[PDB]
C-alpha cells in the first residue's frame, strides 16, 4: 500500500533538432532577408539554450522558459538575422521603430522566445563590415511574419522616380556600419526567433522525456509510454514480437511491458494487500 519509488522510462533521446545549425551558423542573413528554417520531427532540448550565459536576451512571450521541454508542437520556425544592439528590444510583440515596422514585425499574440547574443568577434572587422543591410524606407508597415526583398526606389514625393536615385528618390536598403571599436548598442547582435505553431496536425516536435533508473523486486509505480500502473517489476521468460510494446493477461489486466531502452520484457505483479 506504500509505493515508495517512482520510475519513469522512455526510449533513448535520438534525432535531436538541428539547433546548432541555426545557432552556430557561420554566415547569417540581413534583417530584411531573414531565413525561416522549419523545425519538425525531432526532439528539441531547450535546456541547452537557456543554460548558456552566452545569450544576452532570452525573453519568452506566451510561454515559460522552464516549461519548454514539457510541451509539444507541430513545427517551429527559426528566424535568424543580424541586428544592431540598440534595436534588439524592437523584436518583441507590440514594439515600433524602423526594424519592427519595415524589416521584421512580431504579432501581438506571438508565442515563442527571442534569443540574441553579441557577435562583435565575428561580424565586425577593421575598416567597416558593410555586408549586412536593413530596410529604412517603405510605403507601409509589414504584416506579422512577412518578408520584403523589393529593391524599388522609394518615391517619397509626388515626382515619379524613374528607377534612379535623386530628390525624393531614395534606395530602400541601407547597410550597417560594423566596426570593432563601436560601443554597446551599435555592435552587431545575432538574434534568432523561435516561433511555436500549433495546428490540427499531430505534434511532431516535443521536449526530451527524461528517463529514470530501473528497480527490481520492489512495489513501484511505473510509466513507460502511457501505462501508469503500480507493481513489482521482475525479469520475464517470454518473448514479445519486435513491434509489440506491452501485453496483458486473459483477465484484461496489464501483465508485462517491454523496456523502451533495453528491449527486455518485464513482468508486472500487483503488490499484495
Amino acid at each position: 500500500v506504500q509505493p515508495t519509488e517512482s520510475i519513469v522510462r522512455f526510449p533513448n533521446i535520438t534525432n535531436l533538432c538541428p539547433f546548432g545549425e541555426v545557432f552556430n551558423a557561420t554566415r547569417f542573413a540581413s534583417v530584411y532577408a531573414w531565413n525561416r528554417k522549419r523545425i519538425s520531427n525531432c526532439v528539441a532540448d531547450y535546456s541547452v539554450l537557456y543554460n548558456s550565459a552566452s545569450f544576452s536576451t532570452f525573453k519568452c512571450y506566451g510561454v515559460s522558459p522552464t516549461k519548454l521541454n514539457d510541451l509539444c508542437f507541430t513545427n517551429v520556425y527559426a528566424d535568424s538575422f543580424v541586428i544592431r544592439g540598440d534595436e534588439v528590444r524592437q523584436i518583441a510583440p507590440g514594439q515600433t521603430g524602423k526594424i519592427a515596422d519595415y524589416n521584421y514585425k512580431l504579432p501581438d499574440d506571438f508565442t515563442g522566445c527571442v534569443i540574441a547574443w553579441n557577435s562583435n568577434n565575428l561580424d565586425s572587422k577593421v575598416g567597416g563590415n558593410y555586408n549586412y543591410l536593413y530596410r529604412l524606407f517603405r510605403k507601409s508597415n509589414l504584416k506579422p511574419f512577412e518578408r520584403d526583398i523589393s529593391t524599388e526606389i522609394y518615391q517619397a514625393g509626388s515626382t515619379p522616380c524613374n528607377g534612379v536615385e535623386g530628390f525624393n528618390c531614395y534606395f530602400p536598403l541601407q547597410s550597417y556600419g560594423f566596426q570593432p571599436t563601436n560601443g554597446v548598442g551599435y555592435q552587431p547582435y545575432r538574434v534568432v526567433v523561435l516561433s511555436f505553431e500549433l495546428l490540427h496536425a499531430p505534434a511532431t516536435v516535443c521536449g526530451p522525456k527524461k528517463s529514470t533508473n530501473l528497480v527490481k523486486n520492489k512495489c513501484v509505480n511505473f510509466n513507460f509510454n502511457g501505462l501508469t500502473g503500480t507493481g513489482v517489476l521482475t525479469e520475464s521468460n517470454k518473448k514479445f514480437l519486435p513491434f509489440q510494446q506491452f501485453g496483458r493477461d486473459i483477465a484484461d489486466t496489464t501483465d508485462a511491458v517491454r523496456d523502451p531502452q533495453t528491449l527486455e520484457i518485464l513482468d508486472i505483479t500487483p503488490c499484495s494487500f
Binding site: 540598440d86 567597416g128 529604412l136 524606407f137 522609394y154 517619397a156 514625393g157 509626388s158 530628390f167 525624393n168 531614395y170 541601407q174 556600419g177 566596426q179 571599436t181 563601436n182 560601443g183 554597446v184 548598442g185 551599435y186 555592435q187
Partner: protein, 595 residues
C-alpha cells in the same frame, strides 16, 4: 506627400550616412593624434575632405526644403543647422581670398618669431620664450621689450589682412541675411518658435552689459587689491590712482591673472592645497585617477564609463617611439565610442583635468541618444561649464579628504580659504572684463560703429575704461594690437567664455541647493547627491534639441543667465577685499598714462 514627411525622410537618410562618415573621419583623426606619421595625416585629410564634400552636397540638397512650412521644432532645427551655407554664398574668388587670408594669418600667428636686438643669432618664439618671459619674469624692461616686440613684429603684419578679413566676413554675413559678422556670431544664442523661451540677438548684448554692470564692483575691488600688491614689486612704475600697465599682468595679453598669484597672495605663510606628494606616496596612477573620477560620477548618479573607453583610450604617454599630442581632449566618435586623449601625469592639476574631460564625456554620452545634428550642447558654453563644475566640485577639501588624498585631521583655516578664493578670482573673474571688452570691440568693428582709422584708438580707450589696463607706449594705427590673440586671428568666438563662466556658477549654485548643502558655495560637494545628479542629467539629455533657455530653466530654474551666483561664490573674498581696501583708492582714472 507633404513637405514635412519628405524632410523627415531626408533627415533619416542623412542621419544614416553622416553618422558612419563622421565616425570614419573621427577614427582617422584619432589615429593621427595618437600616432603622428605621414600616412595617418593623409588618411585624416582624405576623410576630412570626404566629410566636407558630403556636408556640402547634403546642404545643397536640403536648401530645397522651405523652413516656413515645417511645423515640427526638431525637424526645423535640424534643417536650419543643415542649411548653414556660410562659406558658399560668396563668389569663388572672394572665398579663395578669404581662405588665403585666414591661412596666412594663422601662419603669421603660429610661425611668428622675434629676435633680440643684441643677439641676432638666437630669436624667440611665442610659446617657449614669450609666455615664459611674461609669466615667470619680474623685470619691467624685459617684459616691456617682449610686449612691444610681440605687438610690433606680428601686430603690424596683420593690419591689412584683418582690414580685408572684416570686409569679407561682413559681405558673407550680409549674404546670409544677417546685419554683420557679429550678428552671425550672436545667432548661436538665437532661439525662435517657442513661446516664452525666445531670445533675440541684441538681448544677448543687453544681458552681457547688465551682468558686467552687476559684477563691476567685485572686479574693481580685485583690481585695487592687485594694484596695491603690484606697487610693492614695482615702486615707480605703477600709480595708486591710474590703471595697471599692459605688460605687468602675468600674461602676454592680460587675459588670465593666474601668474600674478605669487605676487598678490593674501597669506604666503600657508601653502595651497597640494595633494601631489600624498598622491605619489600612495602609489597612484592615471588608471587610478580615472577610476576615482568614474567613482565620483557614478556616486553623483551618472552611468559608468563604457568598456571601449577603458580598452581604447590612451590615458598615459605611449613613450618616445610613438609621438602624440599631449593636449587633454574628449573624443566623441559618434557610434557609441567615447575616448579621452590625455598624457596624464600624477598631479592634482591632472586630476582636475581628468574630471573635466570625464564630465565632457558624460555630456557626450547623455546627448548621444539624439539625432546627429542635435548631438551637441544647447549652447557654445554648456560643455565647458559642465566640465568646470565637476572640476570645482572635485577640488574641494572635503572631497579630497573623502577620497583619501587629504588627511582627515586637516583643519579648514580661513587663510587657505581666502587664498583659494583669490586664485579662483584671478583665474576666472580676471578674464571677464577682458572677454567683454574684446567681444564688444569685435562687435562694434563688425557692425561699423568704429571707423578704420580709429580701431586701436577706441580699443585702448575701452581697455582703459572698461578694463584697468593702460598701454605703456602710444601705438598708432599701424600697431594692430587686438589681432595679437589666437582667438581673434583664427576666426574664433570669444563671448563663449563669458557665457560659460556665468553658466558654471549658476549650475554650481543650483546643484548645491539641490544637494541640501549649507554654508559657503565654494565649499560645496555634490559627490553623494543623486538629486543634483538627476537634475543635471535632465539638462544633459536635452542636448541641442531644446533651446538653451529651457535647459537653463530645467537645471537652475531661470530662462536667463544671472551673475548673482558668481557674486555669491566670491562673497567672503568680496568682504575680505573690502576690508583690505580701506585706505586704498578703489577704482581707476583714465587720465593717467605711463608716457
Amino acid at each position: 506627400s507633404t513637405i514635412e514627411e519628405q524632410a523627415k525622410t531626408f533627415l533619416d537618410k542623412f542621419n544614416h550616412e553622416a553618422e558612419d562618415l563622421f565616425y570614419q573621419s573621427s577614427l582617422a583623426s584619432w589615429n593621427y593624434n595618437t600616432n603622428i606619421t605621414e600616412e595617418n595625416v593623409q588618411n585624416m585629410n582624405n576623410a576630412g575632405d570626404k566629410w566636407s564634400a558630403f556636408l556640402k552636397e547634403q546642404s545643397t540638397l536640403a536648401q530645397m526644403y522651405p523652413l516656413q512650412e515645417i511645423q515640427n521644432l526638431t525637424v526645423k532645427l535640424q534643417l536650419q543647422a543643415l542649411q548653414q551655407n556660410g562659406s558658399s554664398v560668396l563668389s569663388e574668388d572672394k572665398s579663395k581670398r578669404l581662405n588665403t587670408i585666414l591661412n596666412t594669418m594663422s601662419t603669421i600667428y603660429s610661425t611668428g618669431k622675434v629676435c633680440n636686438p643684441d643677439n641676432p643669432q638666437e630669436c624667440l618664439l611665442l610659446e617657449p620664450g614669450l609666455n615664459e618671459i611674461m609669466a615667470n619674469s619680474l623685470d619691467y624692461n624685459e617684459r616691456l621689450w617682449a610686449w612691444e616686440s610681440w605687438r610690433s613684429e606680428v601686430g603690424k603684419q596683420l593690419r591689412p589682412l584683418y582690414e580685408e578679413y572684416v570686409v569679407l566676413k561682413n559681405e558673407m554675413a550680409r549674404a546670409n541675411h544677417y546685419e554683420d559678422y557679429g550678428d552671425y556670431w550672436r545667432g548661436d544664442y538665437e532661439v525662435n518658435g517657442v513661446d516664452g523661451y525666445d531670445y533675440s540677438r541684441g538681448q544677448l548684448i543687453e544681458d552681457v552689459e547688465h551682468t558686467f554692470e552687476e559684477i563691476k564692483p567685485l572686479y574693481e575691488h580685485l583690481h585695487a587689491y592687485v594694484r596695491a600688491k603690484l606697487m610693492n614689486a614695482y615702486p615707480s612704475y605703477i600709480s595708486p590712482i591710474g590703471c595697471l600697465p599692459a605688460h605687468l599682468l602675468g600674461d602676454m595679453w592680460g587675459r588670465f591673472w593666474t601668474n600674478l598669484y605669487s605676487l598678490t597672495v593674501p597669506f604666503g605663510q600657508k601653502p595651497n592645497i597640494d595633494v601631489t606628494d600624498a598622491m605619489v606616496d600612495q602609489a597612484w596612477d592615471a588608471q587610478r585617477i580615472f577610476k576615482e573620477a568614474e567613482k565620483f560620477f557614478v556616486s553623483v548618479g551618472l552611468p559608468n564609463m563604457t568598456q571601449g573607453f577603458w580598452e581604447n583610450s590612451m590615458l598615459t604617454d605611449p613613450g618616445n617611439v610613438q609621438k602624440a599630442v599631449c593636449h587633454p581632449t574628449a573624443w566623441d566618435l559618434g557610434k557609441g565610442d567615447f575616448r579621452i586623449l590625455m598624457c596624464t601625469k600624477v598631479t592634482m592639476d591632472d586630476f582636475l583635468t581628468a574630471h573635466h574631460e570625464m564630465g565632457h564625456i558624460q555630456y557626450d554620452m547623455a546627448y548621444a541618444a539624439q539625432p546627429f545634428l542635435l548631438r551637441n550642447g544647447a549652447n557654445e558654453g554648456f560643455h565647458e561649464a559642465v566640465g568646470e563644475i565637476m572640476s570645482l566640485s572635485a577640488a574641494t577639501p572635503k572631497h579630497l579628504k573623502s577620497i583619501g588624498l587629504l588627511s582627515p585631521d586637516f583643519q579648514e583655516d580661513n587663510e587657505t580659504e581666502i587664498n583659494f578664493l583669490l586664485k579662483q578670482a584671478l583665474t576666472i573673474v580676471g578674464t571677464l572684463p577682458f572677454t567683454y571688452m574684446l567681444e564688444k570691440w569685435r562687435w562694434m568693428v563688425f557692425k561699423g560703429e568704429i571707423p578704420k582709422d580709429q580701431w586701436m584708438k577706441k580699443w585702448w580707450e575701452m581697455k582703459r575704461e572698461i578694463v584697468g589696463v593702460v598701454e605703456p607706449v602710444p601705438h598708432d594705427e599701424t600697431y594692430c594690437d587686438p589681432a595679437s590673440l589666437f582667438h581673434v586671428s583664427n576666426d574664433y568666438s570669444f563671448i563663449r567664455y563669458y557665457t560659460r563662466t556665468l553658466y558654471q556658477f549658476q549650475f554650481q549654485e543650483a546643484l548645491c541647493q539641490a544637494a541640501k548643502h549649507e554654508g559657503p558655495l565654494h565649499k560645496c560637494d555634490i559627490s553623494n547627491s543623486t538629486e543634483a545628479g538627476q537634475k543635471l542629467f535632465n539638462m544633459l539629455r536635452l542636448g541641442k534639441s531644446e533651446p538653451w533657455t529651457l535647459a537653463l530653466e530645467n537645471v537652475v530654474g531661470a530662462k536667463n543667465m544671472n551673475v548673482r551666483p558668481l557674486l555669491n561664490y566670491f562673497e567672503p573674498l568680496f568682504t575680505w577685499l573690502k576690508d583690505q581696501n580701506k585706505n586704498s583708492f578703489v577704482g581707476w582714472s583714465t587720465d593717467w598714462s605711463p608716457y
